[PDB]
Structures are given as structure tokens and as C-alpha cells.
Structure 1
């Protein structure tokens, strides 16, 4: 029904029509997570190498 905030220009126009009214992690923790996973990889790799050594 009610058309509001109509703005016009050469490229086009915009407006709003209303039908009815209503009724973070730090760099430290990031680099620690990445390095904890890298350790787990290196631990798993060492278990494999030890197993192969046996």
C-alpha cells in the first residue's frame, strides 16, 4: 500500500512498500589449533614408523 523512501537516479530507482507493520577466536588460539592437529599427524606418523621398525 504505502510507498516510502523513494530514491531516483539516472541508473534506476529504489523504494520500500509496506503491506503491514509488525505485531571470535584470536590469532593465538587459531595457531594453537593448527599446531595441535600437526602434532597428532606427527604422532600418528611416528606410530607407523615405529610399527614398521618392529
Structure 2
């Protein structure tokens, strides 16, 4: 066995040397590209921003239309009350008038029965008053 020394280089602030103990066991053949390019890197970053700023904007899509849905449900909360209060006054005013034209009709029907008595108390003296 032999310790072959090649002695690399020599300098003022340090030196170096190569040592080959055993010879190399082999010596043989293996012993689109265009990388990297700025235009492709700035293309992959632009596209990354294109989908990142999309995801958050599309998040606002599910948030803004849901917010204007809370706006329509609170609107519904009042318009259902307003269409109930309208119906409440609609029934009351009709029913109050219904009871008016009901009792004012029987009052006239009353002062017809005890009004036809005056017609009878006009036919009586007509049937009476005889000097003959």
C-alpha cells in the first residue's frame, strides 16, 4: 500500500495538499430548457396573485350577498307587521261600521212597527166620527 501526495498549492496564510490512498476503481462515459427566464417567473407570480386576490374577493361574494340577505330578512320583519296592522285596521273599521248599519237598521224597523200604529190610530177616527 502507498500514500501518494500531489501537493495542491502554497500561500502566506495557509497551505494545502491532495492525498490519494487507493486509485479510482472506474473511468467511463458518464463517469426545452431555457432556465430560469424572468418573463416566466413574473408570469407564475402574476398568476399566483391572480388566484390569491380572487379567493379573498370570492370570499367577499359569499359575505356581501349574505349580508344583503340579513338586510332583506329584517325588511321582511317589518313589512309582514305592516301588512298585518293594515289588515287589523281593515277588519276593525269594517266590523265597527257593520255593527253601525246593523243596529241603525233595526231602529228604523222598530220605528216602522210603532209608526204603523199611528196609521191605525188615523183609520180608527176615520171609521168613527159619526153625527148620522
Is TM (by shorter chain) over 0.5? yes
TM-score by length of 1: 0.78
Return the structure number with greater helix share.
Answer: 2
**Which consecutive aligned stretches of 4+ in structure 1 deviate over 2 angstroms post-superposition?**
5-10
Q: How many residues get paired?
A: 52
Give the CA deviation at 1:11. Answer: 1.6
Return 5+ residue gaps in structure 1 as ranges: none
Q: Cα distance 1:19–1:26, how it changes in 2: closer, same or farther (>3 A)?
A: same
Query: Which protein, 1 or 2, shows the higher relative CO under an 8 Å CA cutoff with sep ≥ 6?
Result: 1
TM-score by length of 2: 0.36
Return 5+ residue gaps in structure 2 as ranges: 26-34, 63-131
2:57 and 2:11 mapped to 1: Cα distance?
67
Return the structure number with greater strand share.
Answer: 1
